[PDB]
């Protein structure tokens, strides 16, 4: 499995922590510690919007599935929602959600008026953006929650935390259905398999693992003796046959999920691979690194 | 076969041996603070150019032939300019390093390494263009002079055009003046990052040695002419080979305890405090 | 699952000795640096000792220097602490802590209030 | 150019965005950023008389200092955010012997952290007056907590401030030497520590930070050009 | 002068004396072959140059 860099997106000033693809599979949003979000047009390598932030320390960003809003947050314990489409013609802060007691590590939209967040205070939350209040709070992790992954049907979601633990939550009731263990260190990234009956986790263990919801246990492990660095990001292809994972060795590895055999390496960055994403049509892979660069591979 | 030619050949071979020894010492201690402080790649290029300078000095001796008279002047004219260009670029880079006041230069390693050679090639390329124009328009030739004396035939070289030689000399002097200016600026820096011995070389080789040979070059004929050339060349080469390396070589081989990271760190901190 | 179990505590007269053991499971024990920490009544957590993977590097805190010794058997996947000449202030609950990530020397958050890779501890009274 | 008119206007908009980004690039690359660390009772809040952020100015150079305090006890994850900062300013209370070993362990953890392997540390040994009074009083003994103090002698290069007692100097330099010997075991020349003695009335701290940052930048530039 | 080239007496006079003597010796070692090569009316010129160079050296040093 050989991929090549088709686009290189330049313009950020500092390390990039987060990125998120649009549903149209063409526009993406990226976040840097310089204090800026940028919406890139992948096809033309054009800057559509540059949003300055009130806080430089941003750790996450999300793109609304409708395409009318973006979200961000970080060490300021606040989730900011920016309205992209206004009559005045400029991006303005739509809402400023407060209530977490720790840094905001991840956020994902459900629709235009619902968002799910995970924080460093060892909890997740479901918000109503209009009222700015937490409709639900998910508790149970004994460590910082790093990443979360919404289900394709937007009914369930998993969270992985710095206690070698992942938890499955139902948004409507607000209770932990199942708890998955098996890692030895902090989980840094988590992602569902496309049909929704399995998910993959990466950690500082330098191993990725596949868990199945129905069997309530892991099925496969992905590691090599040479690898001693932790996984920062993980994602699946459109069909789930390939598992893409970025590491601290400045490289991304492609794994045959069904056989746990490495099939290729994406090696173009010169610093830590912080964020990774795959388009909704499965046509490209975006990797953003601490070297202030974001690349498209196909 | 003449004793004077033997002496000149021995001096050139001795210079070549010393240059090779210095190069080998620098290669051996290639990852030590003293050798790191003086740009490695530019030092290697400069040492190769000094070897070329001695080889060029070797062209003048012998019975003049057309190709030798063609090749003799451009060889030294290009080699000396290459040496001066290396020194100039090195001083300019160290000045830019020491004058920066911003968290990081953000200067790519490959980009800087290639940029150094690119600037060096600019200078040498102007020299090569002048030489190519000269050799295309009016090549120098050999000539059996039978007018200077009645009993003697002098086999000498006729310069195709004195204007081209004047242009080579003028360009070399201009580049040397620019290098002198930049080296004069870089004298307050720590002693490991200075190139203030180029001032000494210019004082002792350009204003004393080369000056004192002006009358000899003004009115003289026959083998002595070539003599002056060779001697002048040797002087410059030896002086340069001294003023840039010998002291450092000493500290690298003898007094080895001064070739330590702590010494360089202390000197840089002292520069920072002042 | 990461499990650390401490044993070998109780009440001992001053000047005695005591051996603490920590059994580890759910991870590769030889890949991690290990620590011994204590918490005294009315006081917070206090780092006591640590030992590296191969056991070549061993460090103590000041009060225990010479009186205590730390060791590890990677074949048995167990950590040992020998305690000699117990001063009356040695009374505390002792924890065997594991460093968060393998192949590292830095060990953040071992004396934190809520650290996942720690144990229940053993009470030592002098 | 095989571009439509609207595509060309989009390109022009992107160009204007790039110009604004370049201006922000100049502004951002001008300013130095510092991370303030140190436990409570050390007085890190009042080190510069100029609290999550702070601006100050020293001779036409801008410093921006960050004190992260609204988080949990664990700092293993968010600390990675501060790996581009010019300096970590670590403040240690020099009078309390009961919690000095905790400060030593924290300084060790910061110094050997993987993502802080290139950041230099400016060390402020605060509260020197209280240490001096406690030493001259004699109620507290460093030997109780640090037995190595007995087999210690004052440095040859140690400087006594005009008017003082040798015991006070011995205590000060022992405290400094603990952090220094921590700092001179894994540095490898990539990063260094700058220790200072500062009381509460001291007002020279900003100048010391300025000089230390100058030195840090010089060393970084030398290494980047592969000259050191 | 070279024995005490590091002594700082009289604004570090010994270093300048050493440099001046080096200039003198270089001037005359270069004078030898320059005089041996000159032919005609210019054989005096070299002497003047030498007489200038060395002299200037001392002053400037
Ligand atoms: C055909 C025309 C030829 C022109 C060629 C001239 C080239 C440029 C002039 C340079 C020059 C000649 C002065 C000429 C006198 C004029 C006529 C005199 C007649 C009477 C009127 C001016 O020398 C001046 O000397 C000043 C006196 O010290 C000094 O001042 C300072 O100190 C004040 C005191 O405390 C203080 O207060 C003031 O603040 C300071 O600034 C100036 O910085 C310096 O410019 C000498 O430059 C010096 O040359 C040295 C080489 O020997 C050279 O050392 C290098 O090499 C050494 C050995 O290899 C090696 O050992 C050294 O390590 C190495 O560094 C020095 O770097 C260079 O500087
Ligand atoms: C910053 C400082 C160090 C300036 C550096 C300049 C030197 C490299 C230049 C300045 C004057 C030059 C000299 C000026 C005049 C001559 C005369 C020239 O004599 C002839 O060309 C023969 C007569 C003729 O054929 O016209 C030989 C080169 C020489 C010695 C030049 C050699 C190089 C010199 C010393
Ligand atoms: C044919 C002959 C007459 C050639 C002429 C040579 C001299 C009359 C000139 C040529 C180059 C000149 C030098 C070129 C450069 C400098 C550097 C300059 O230094 C600085 O100004 C830098 C100060 C700093 O920024 O630190 C002082 C004058 C000086 C020595 C000049 C002094 C006079 C020189 C030697
Ligand atoms: C074939 C024969 C007749 C050769 C005659 C040529 C001489 C006029 C040349 C040859 C060797 C040259 C010397 C070679 C080396 C040096 C070292 C150099 O020493 C330093 O620069 C010391 C540096 C410092 O001061 O730290 C001074 C010039 C000098 C004497 C050169 C001056 C001119 C010399 C004597
Ligand atoms: C060629 C004809 C037309 C006239 C001959 C004049 C030259 C041979 C003279 C004139 C100016 C003289 C120079 C004037 C000043 C100096 C400064 C002097 O520098 C120092 O000695 C300072 C060293 C220190 O600062 O320690 C070295 C000799 C030198 C180059 C002199 C060498 C001989 C020069 C070039
Ligand atoms: C004509 C000139 C350039 C030829 C130069 C040849 C000499 C200077 C070179 C040729 C091969 C070189 C050697 C090659 C490899 C090593 C191994 C190293 O660990 C120490 C230095 C040493 C031993 C080198 C010293 C310099 C050396 C001997
Ligand atoms: C500060 C810089 C510009 C000074 C540069 C001066 C150089 C370019 C000047 C100074 C004296 C000049 C020389 C003076 C006399 C002659 C004799 C002539 O028959 C050929 C050219 C030649 C040899 C000149 C070449 C150019 C020269 C070397
Ligand atoms: C004409 C040529 C070939 C002679 C070669 C002799 C060389 C190798 C000798 C001659 C005199 C020597 C110098 C004499 C004095 C010093 C000063 C000292 O602090 C550093 C070494 C140094 C600079 C010596 C280096 C070696 C040296 C330059
Ligand atoms: C052809 C032959 C005779 C030329 C011989 C040149 C002699 C005079 C030269 C060659 C090497 C020179 C030495 C090289 C280096 C230094 C170091 C310097 O800090 C003081 C001068 C000193 C010590 C020089 C004195 C003069 C010297 C010995
Ligand atoms: C008239 C001319 C040709 C005589 C030339 C003689 C030269 C080669 C002689 C004369 C004086 C000698 C110098 C006298 C003093 C010293 C200082 C000593 O610590 C090293 C040798 C050194 C540096 C000598 C080197 C050689 C020297 C320069
Ligand atoms: C820098 O001047 C040059 C440029 C190229 C070649 C040459 C030489 C190889 N031939 C002419 C020699 C000119 C000359 C005569 C007496 C004293 C010094 C000098 Cl230099 C010199």
Evaluated on CA atoms A22, A27, A31, A35, the torsion sign reads: negative
Distance separating alpha carbons of residues B58 and B51, to the nearest angstrom: 11
What are the DSSP E strand ranges found in A164-272? 165-170, 175-181, 187-192, 198-203, 208-212, 217-222, 231-236, 242-247, 252-256, 261-266
What is the distance, to the nearest Å, from the Cα of residue B106 to the centroid of all Cα atoms in its chain? 32
Whether the Cβ atoms of residue B124 and residue B97 lie closer than 8 Å to each other: no
Q: Which residue of D lies nearest to B36 if distances are taken between CA atoms?
A: D227
Ligand 11 pocket: which of B77, B209, B225 to mutate (most atoms <8 Å of CB)? B77
Mutation choice for D interface testing from A7, A10, A11, A271 by most D CBs within 10 A = A11
Q: What is the DSSP string of E17-58?
A: HHHHHHHHHHHHHHHHHHHHH--STTHHHHHHHHHHHHHHHH
Helix axes D166-183, D128-137, angle to 10 degrees: 130
* Minimal-distance CA residue to ligand 11 atom 14: B229
**How many helices (H) and strands (E) in chain A?**
0, 28
Cα first-last separation, chain B: 59
Mutation choice for B interface testing from E22, E23, E37 by most B CBs within 10 A = E37
Distance separating alpha carbons of residues D22 and A108, to the nearest angstrom: 31
3-state SS, residue B272: helix
C-facing residues of D in 162-191 (CB < 8 A) are: 186
Instruction: Specify the DSSP element, H or E, that contains A78.
Output: strand A78-83
Which residues are bridge partners to A128 per DSSP?
A114, A133
Whether the Cβ atoms of residue C46 and residue C37 lie closer than 8 Å to each other: yes
Strand order in the sheet with A58-63: A58-63, A69-74, A78-83, A92-98
Distance separating alpha carbons of residues A173 and A170, to the nearest angstrom: 6
List of chain A residues whose C-beta atoms are within 8 Å of the C-beta of residue C114: 142-143
What is the distance, to the nearest Å, from the Cα of residue C12 to the centroid of all Cα atoms in its chain? 18
Those residues of chain B whose CB sits closer than 8 Å to some CB in chain E are: 204, 207-209, 211-216, 218-221, 224, 227-228, 231, 235
* Minimal-distance CA residue to ligand 5 atom 28: E57
Distance separating alpha carbons of residues B143 and B222, to the nearest angstrom: 12
Question: How many residues does this entry show for chain D?
Answer: 228
D-facing residues of B in 34-73 (CB < 8 A) are: 36-37, 39
Give the tokens for residue C79.
Answer: 């950590």
CA angle A197, A106, A160 (to 5 degrees): 45
3-state SS, residue A296: strand
Instruction: Specify the DSSP element, H or E, that contains D188.
Output: none
Distance separating alpha carbons of residues C13 and C87, to the nearest angstrom: 9
* C113 with D73: Cβ contact below 8 A: yes
C-alpha pair distances (Å), B58 with each of B52, B168, B205, B233, D214: 10, 20, 20, 10, 51
CB burial class (10 A; 0-12, 13-18, 19+) of residue B132? exposed
DSSP state of A2: -
For residue D84, give every residue at least 6 positions away whose Cβ sits within 8 Å of its Cβ, in sequence order, or none.
Answer: A14, A15, A33, D33
What is the distance, to the nearest Å, from the Cα of residue A121 to the centroid of all Cα atoms in its chain? 18
Evaluated on CA atoms B43, B44, B50, B53, the torsion sign reads: negative
Q: Shortest Cα distance from D228 to chain A (angstroms)?
A: 21
A217-222 and A123-128 strand pairing: unpaired
- Please name the residue that has the structure tokens 């992107």: D14
Strand order in the sheet with A261-266: A231-236, A242-247, A252-256, A261-266
Give the tokens for residue A138.
Answer: 């998910």
Mutation choice for C interface testing from D78, D113, D174 by most C CBs within 10 A = D113
Q: Shortest Cα distance from D134 to chain B (angstroms)?
A: 34
Distance separating alpha carbons of residues D179 and D196, to the nearest angstrom: 11
- Please name the residue that has the structure tokens 């991370």: D35
Whether the Cβ atoms of residue B24 and residue B222 lie closer than 8 Å to each other: no
Distance separating alpha carbons of residues B70 and B92, to the nearest angstrom: 34
- Nearest residue to D64 (alpha-carbon basis) of D30, D41, D111: D30
List of chain A residues whose C-beta atoms are within 8 Å of the C-beta of residue D13: 46-47
Give the tokens for residue D138.
Answer: 């004699």
3-state SS, residue A225: coil
3-state SS, residue C25: strand
Instruction: Specify the DSSP element, H or E, that contains A206.
Output: none
D-facing residues of A in 215-274 (CB < 8 A) are: none
Those residues of chain C whose CB sits closer than 8 Å to some CB in chain D are: 46-47, 61-63, 65, 100, 104-109, 111-115
CB burial class (10 A; 0-12, 13-18, 19+) of residue E48? exposed
Distance separating alpha carbons of residues A59 and A274, to the nearest angstrom: 10
Whether the Cβ atoms of residue A231 and residue A222 lie closer than 8 Å to each other: no
Chain breaks in chain D (C to N over 2.5 A) after: 50
What are the DSSP E strand ranges found in chain D? 32-37, 53-57, 62-66, 87-93, 120-126, 193-197
Phi/psi at C8 (5° precision): 100, 45
Distance separating alpha carbons of residues D110 and D118, to the nearest angstrom: 11
Establish whether residue B11 lines the binding site of ligand 4, counting it when its CB lies within 6 angstroms of any ligand atom: yes
Whether the Cβ atoms of residue A136 and residue A118 lie closer than 8 Å to each other: no
DSSP state of A155: S
Distance separating alpha carbons of residues A288 and A32, to the nearest angstrom: 10
Q: Which residue of E lies nearest to B210 if distances are taken between CA atoms?
A: E30
3-state SS, residue B132: helix
Distance separating alpha carbons of residues D100 and D134, to the nearest angstrom: 15
Q: Shortest Cα distance from D159 to chain C (angstroms)?
A: 28
Distance separating alpha carbons of residues A184 and A186, to the nearest angstrom: 7
Name all contacts of E22-30 with Cβ < 8 Å and 24+ positions apart.
E22/B204, E23/B204, E23/B208, E23/E53, E23/E54, E23/E57, E23/E61, E24/E54, E24/E57, E24/E58, E26/B204, E26/B208, E26/B209, E27/B208, E27/B212, E27/E53, E27/E54, E27/E57, E28/E54, E30/B208, E30/B209, E30/B212, E30/B213, E30/B235
* D217 with B107: Cβ contact below 8 A: no
Query: Which among C27, C101, C116 has CB closest to A163?
Result: C116
Evaluated on CA atoms B114, B117, B122, B128, the torsion sign reads: negative
Distance separating alpha carbons of residues A164 and A158, to the nearest angstrom: 13
Whether the Cβ atoms of residue A77 and residue A103 lie closer than 8 Å to each other: yes
List of chain D residues whose C-beta atoms are within 8 Å of the C-beta of residue C103: none
Q: What is the DSSP string of D6-63?
A: HHHHHHHHHHHHHHHHHHHHHHHHHSEEEEEE--TTS-TTSS-----EEEEESSS-EE
3-state SS, residue C69: strand
For residue D66, give every residue at least 6 positions away whose Cβ sits within 8 Å of its Cβ, in sequence order, or none.
Answer: D33, D34, D35, D36, D52, D53, D54, D82, D85
Distance separating alpha carbons of residues B52 and D131, to the nearest angstrom: 68
The rounded Å distance from CA B19 to ligand 6 centre is 13
Phi/psi at A180 (5° precision): -115, 130
Phi/psi at A222 (5° precision): -130, 105
For residue A295, give every residue at least 6 positions away whose Cβ sits within 8 Å of its Cβ, in sequence order, or none.
Answer: A5, A7, A8, A9, A268, A269, A286, A287, A288, A289
Give the tokens for residue D199.
Answer: 């009381």
Ligand 8 pocket: which of B11, B250, B256 to mutate (most atoms <8 Å of CB)? B250
Q: Is D32's Cβ below 8 Å from some Cβ in B?
A: yes
Chain breaks in chain A (C to N over 2.5 A) after: none
C-alpha pair distances (Å), C81 with each of C21, C26, C69, C105: 6, 21, 6, 20
- Nearest residue to B75 (alpha-carbon basis) of B241, B237, B210, B217: B237
Give the tokens for residue C91.
Answer: 């009374």
Helix axes B40-60, B66-98, angle to 10 degrees: 160
Name all contacts of B28-36 with Cβ < 8 Å and 24+ positions apart.
B29/B252, B29/B259, B32/B252, B32/B259, B33/B192, B33/B259, B33/B260, B33/B261, B33/B263, B33/B264, B33/D228, B34/B192, B34/B248, B34/B251, B34/B252, B34/B258, B34/B259, B34/B264, B35/B252, B36/D226, B36/D227, B36/D228
Experimental structure resolution, Å: 3.5
3-state SS, residue A11: coil
Whether the Cβ atoms of residue D100 and residue D92 lie closer than 8 Å to each other: yes
Distance separating alpha carbons of residues C58 and C49, to the nearest angstrom: 8
- Nearest residue to D124 (alpha-carbon basis) of D103, D109, D144: D103
D87-93 and D32-37 strand pairing: parallel
C-alpha pair distances (Å), C110 with each of B88, B199, D53, D68, D214: 55, 60, 28, 20, 35
Give the max Cα distance, chain B: 76
Mutation choice for C interface testing from D39, D105, D144, D145 by most C CBs within 10 A = D105
Q: Which residues of A20-29 are buried (b: 16+ CB within 10 A; e: fewer)?
A: bbbeebbbbb
Whether the Cβ atoms of residue A77 and residue D70 lie closer than 8 Å to each other: yes
User: Cα-Cα-Cα-Cα dihedral of B254, B256, B262, B263, to 10°?
Assistant: -10
* Minimal-distance CA residue to ligand 3 atom 23: B185
Helix axes B261-273, D205-224, angle to 10 degrees: 130
Establish whether residue B242 lines the binding site of ligand 9, counting it when its CB lies within 6 angstroms of any ligand atom: yes
Ligand 10 pocket: which of E25, E28, E30, E32 to mutate (most atoms <8 Å of CB)? E25
Distance separating alpha carbons of residues B169 and B77, to the nearest angstrom: 8
C-alpha pair distances (Å), B113 with each of A84, B90, B108, B135, E56: 45, 11, 8, 33, 42
Whether the Cβ atoms of residue C33 and residue C103 lie closer than 8 Å to each other: no
B-facing residues of D in 169-228 (CB < 8 A) are: 189, 211, 214-215, 217-222, 224-228
The rounded Å distance from CA B76 to ligand 11 centre is 8
What is the distance, to the nearest Å, from the Cα of residue B186 to the centroid of all Cα atoms in its chain? 19
Query: Which among A143, A204, A206 has CB closest to C116?
Result: A143
Which residues are bridge partners to A212 per DSSP?
A198, A217
Q: Which residue of B lies nearest to D213 if distances are taken between CA atoms?
A: B103
A158: left (phi over 0), alpha (psi -120 to 50) or beta: beta
Q: Is D77's Cβ below 8 Å from some Cβ in A?
A: yes
Whether the Cβ atoms of residue A39 and residue A54 lie closer than 8 Å to each other: no
Instruction: Specify the DSSP element, H or E, that contains C72.
Output: strand C68-73
**How was this entry determined?**
cryo-EM
Please state, as a whole number, how many other Cβ atoms lie within 10 Å of the Cβ of residue B183. 23
Name all contacts of B250-255 with Cβ < 8 Å and 24+ positions apart.
B251/B34, B252/B25, B252/B29, B252/B32, B252/B34, B252/B35, B253/B25
C-alpha pair distances (Å), A14 with each of A272, D25, D55, D121: 12, 10, 20, 21
DSSP state of D114: G
User: Cα-Cα-Cα-Cα dihedral of A215, A163, A158, A212, to 10°?
Assistant: -20
């Amino acid at each position: 499995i050989q991929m090549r860099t088709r686009r290189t997106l330049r313009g950020h000033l500092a390390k990039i922590y987060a990125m998120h693809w649009g549903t149209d599979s063409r526009l993406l949003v990226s976040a840097s510690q310089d204090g800026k979000l940028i919406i890139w047009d992948s096809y033309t390598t054009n800057k559509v919007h540059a949003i300055p932030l009130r806080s430089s320390w941003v750790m996450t960003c999300a793109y609304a599935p409708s395409g009318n809003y973006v979200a961000c947050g970080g060490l300021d314990n606040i989730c900011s929602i920016y309205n992209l489409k206004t009559r005045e013609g400029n991006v303005r802060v739509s809402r400023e959600l407060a209530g977490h007691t720790g840094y905001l590590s991840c956020c994902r939209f459900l629709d235009d008026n619902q968002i799910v967040t995970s924080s460093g205070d060892t909890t997740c939350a479901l918000w109503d953006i209009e009222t700015g209040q937490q409709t639900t709070t998910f508790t149970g992790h004994t460590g910082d929650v790093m990443s979360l992954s919404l289900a394709p049907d937007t009914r369930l979601f998993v969270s992985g935390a710095c206690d070698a633990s992942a938890k499955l939550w139902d948004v409507r009731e607000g209770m932990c259905r199942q708890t998955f263990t098996g890692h030895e260190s902090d989980i840094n990234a988590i992602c569902f398999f496309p049909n929704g009956n399995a998910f993959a986790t990466g950690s500082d263990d330098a191993t990725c693992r596949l868990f199945d919801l129905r069997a309530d246990q892991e099925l496969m492990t992905y590691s090599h003796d040479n690898i001693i660095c932790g996984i920062t990001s993980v994602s699946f292809s459109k069909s789930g046959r390939l598992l893409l994972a970025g590491y601290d060795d400045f490289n991304c590895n492609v794994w045959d999920a069904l056989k746990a055999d490495r099939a290729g390496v994406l090696a173009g960055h010169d610093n830590r691979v912080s964020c990774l994403g795959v388009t909704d049509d499965g046509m490209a892979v975006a990797t953003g690194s601490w070297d202030s660069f974001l690349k498209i591979w196909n | 076969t003449e004793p004077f030619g033997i002496a000149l050949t021995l001096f050139a071979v001795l210079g070549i041996f010393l240059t090779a020894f210095v190069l080998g010492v620098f290669i051996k201690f290639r990852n030590t603070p003293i050798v790191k402080a003086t740009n490695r790649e530019l030092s290697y290029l400069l040492l190769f150019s000094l070897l070329c300078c001695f080889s060029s000095s070797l062209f003048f001796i012998g019975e003049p032939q057309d190709w030798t008279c063609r090749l003799r002047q451009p060889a030294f004219g290009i080699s000396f300019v290459l040496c001066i260009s290396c020194i100039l670029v090195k001083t300019n880079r160290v000045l830019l390093v020491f004058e920066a006041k911003i968290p990081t230069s953000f200067h790519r390693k490959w980009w800087g390494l290639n940029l150094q050679f690119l600037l060096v090639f600019l200078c040498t390329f102007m020299q090569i263009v002048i030489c190519v124009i000269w050799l295309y328009t009016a090549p120098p030739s050999s000539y059996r002079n039978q007018e200077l004396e009645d009993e003697i035939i002098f086999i000498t070289c006729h310069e195709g055009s004195l204007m081209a030689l004047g242009f080579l000399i003028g360009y070399t002097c201009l580049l040397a003046a620019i290098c002198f200016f930049f080296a004069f600026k870089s004298r307050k820096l720590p002693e490991n990052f200075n190139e203030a011995k180029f001032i000494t070389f210019s004082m002792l080789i350009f204003f004393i040695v080369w000056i004192s040979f002006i009358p000899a070059y003004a009115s003289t004929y026959g083998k002595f002419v070539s003599a002056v050339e060779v001697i002048a060349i040797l002087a410059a080469s030896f002086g340069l080979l001294a003023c840039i390396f010998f002291n450092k070589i000493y500290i690298i081989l003898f007094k080895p305890s001064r070739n330590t990271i702590e010494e360089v760190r202390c000197s840089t901190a002292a520069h920072a405090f002042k | 699952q990461v499990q650390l179990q401490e044993s070998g505590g109780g009440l001992v007269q001053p000047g005695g000795s005591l051996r603490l053991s920590c059994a580890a499971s759910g991870f590769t024990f030889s890949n991690y640096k290990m620590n011994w920490v204590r918490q005294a009544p009315g006081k917070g957590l206090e780092w006591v000792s640590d030992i590296s993977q191969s056991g070549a590097s061993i460090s103590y805190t000041g009060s225990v220097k010479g009186r205590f010794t730390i060791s590890r058997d990677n074949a048995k996947n167990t950590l040992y602490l020998q305690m000699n000449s117990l001063k009356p202030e040695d009374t505390a609950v002792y924890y065997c802590a594991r460093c968060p990530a393998p192949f590292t020397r830095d060990c953040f958050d071992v004396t934190s209030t809520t650290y996942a890779y720690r144990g229940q501890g053993t009470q030592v009274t002098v | 150019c095989t571009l439509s008119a609207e595509d060309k206007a989009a390109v022009e908009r992107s160009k204007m965005i790039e110009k604004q980004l370049q201006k922000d690039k100049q502004v951002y690359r001008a300013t130095h950023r510092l991370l303030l660390l140190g436990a409570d009772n050390s007085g890190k809040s009042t080190i510069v008389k100029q609290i999550f952020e702070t601006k100050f100015q020293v001779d036409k150079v801008n410093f921006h200092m960050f004190d992260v305090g609204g988080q949990r006890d664990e700092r293993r994850k968010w600390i990675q955010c501060f790996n581009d900062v010019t300096a970590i300013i670590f403040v240690v209370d020099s009078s309390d012997y009961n919690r000095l070993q905790e400060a030593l362990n924290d300084f060790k953890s910061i110094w050997n952290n993987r993502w802080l392997r290139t950041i230099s540390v400016i060390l402020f040994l605060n509260k020197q007056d209280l240490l001096a009074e406690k030493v001259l009083a004699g109620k507290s003994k460093i030997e109780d907590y640090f037995p190595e103090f007995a087999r210690y002698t004052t440095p040859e290069d140690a400087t006594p401030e005009p008017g003082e007692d040798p015991r006070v100097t011995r205590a000060k330099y022992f405290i400094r030497d603990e952090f220094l010997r921590i700092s001179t075991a894994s540095g490898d020349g990539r990063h260094y520590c700058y220790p200072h003695f500062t009381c509460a009335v001291d007002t020279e701290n900003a100048r010391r930070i300025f000089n230390d940052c100058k030195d840090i930048i010089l060393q970084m530039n030398l290494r980047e050009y592969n000259l050191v």
